[model samples]
Target: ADLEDNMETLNDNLKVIEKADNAAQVKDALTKMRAAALDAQKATPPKLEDKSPDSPEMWDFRHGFDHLVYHIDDALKLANEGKVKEAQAAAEQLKCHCNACHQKYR
Candidate 1:
């Protein structure tokens, strides 16, 4: 559900940014990452009405999904502000959240 949006674009943006060795390149990558992040946020979430408790499609993962997005957003904000440590912390938390959600719900 969290990945309903095209994370590939976000991944691509990240890849581009990660490869940059200069400030200008990093700035460009930041621009791209921001765009992709906003796009990811705009994507529709799975409607709860579409799932039932007994349905194999139902797992009630929205809470975790939203948590991940918001954390990632925080990461992006920190990164844009050049707060590498803060951004990394958010990313680390996001990764742990992902693992936890997958372990429990997926």
Candidate 2:
């Protein structure tokens, strides 16, 4: 449920970041992603619900999700500098980390 909500927010803003041409829009999208991505770290995928909270699977999932936040923060910083191209490049990496989480845990 939480992850579902997070992903909805995440994806909505992700698309914004993908197409946004302005620093304000990029910064706005980063805030949504920062909030959602950090919130998502606490979530246990439905598939992993039966696994121990301390299980390697759970930790790995959280680790993967944390990196997503890391990448978002990276872009957030770039956005503040009015570096739209740099922020866009940093934002581009979010998909890679997201896939890392989904492929393993989905």
Candidate 3:
């Protein structure tokens, strides 16, 4: 299922982010995460297949996913700027979105 696949990728990216030891590693992980987030945004939800893609519920999920993407992008920017701790802090915030969505929909 696309939802499960997306979640696995997201979890893997978060793991990489958590254990990353340097700015370069963080930047790489952020890139992977951004790609995964985009993929997830485009994918159809396995459990929500009964609902239209443009339904209000799905729209809300899309908005939240986009917001998480922004945070991941910001973390990438910080990592590229050599602010390792700041980048990690931003990534930590991204994890909250993950947990929030999972709680609500998964």
Candidate 4:
């Protein structure tokens, strides 16, 4: 539930950034989104041990998270450089990861 809340928080931040009217608002929103993404990573579950020998391999969650982080960082970098449109595009890409993960895991 906490992980879900973090994800929702990040999404809300991105939405605010997308509608931001000035650089300060965009920067603030992206900064908050970055922090939320980091929190989500910390909240992700660790690998669990199976009771039997032939248990299925666990999913590589870090792979998906790395991709999400890449987009989040890229958006922040663009926003810091005052590239508002590119930053918004990167934020949109981050949302795509959220949807993809939900459809596949949730």
Best by TM-score: 2
- Structure candidate 1, residue pairs in collision: none
Q: Could you tally the backbone clashes for each prediction?
A: 0, 0, 0, 0
Model 3 TM-score, 2 decimals: 0.90
Clashing pairs for model 3 are none
Superposed Cα deviation of residue 39, candidate 1 (Å): 9.0
Whichever of 2 and 3 has more TM-score, that candidate is: 2
TM-score for candidate 1, please give it.
Answer: 0.49
Model 1, span 1-106: residue lDDT tens: 2444445554564565555454444445545554554554443334534556555434335455566667666666767677655555555564577577557544
TM-score, prediction 4: 0.75
Q: Once superposed on the true structure, which residue ranges of model 4 sit more than 4 Å away at CA?
A: 44-59
Q: Which stretches of candidate 1 lie over 4 Å from their true place?
A: 1-59
When summed lDDT is taken over every stretch of 10 residues in candidate 2, the lowest stretch is 97-106
Q: lDDT for each of the candidates?
A: 0.54, 0.87, 0.82, 0.69
Ranking by TM-score: 2, 3, 4, 1
What order do you get sorting by lDDT, best first? 2, 3, 4, 1
Error of 1 at 30 (Å): 9.1
Tens digit of per-residue lDDT, candidate 4, span 1-106: 4677877878788789889876667778877776776666555443333322232322344456767777878877888888888778778877778787666545
Q: Per-residue alpha-carbon lDDT of model 2 for 1-106, expressed as tens digits?
A: 4889999998899899989988779999999888887788888889999999999999998888678888888899999999998898889888877777788887
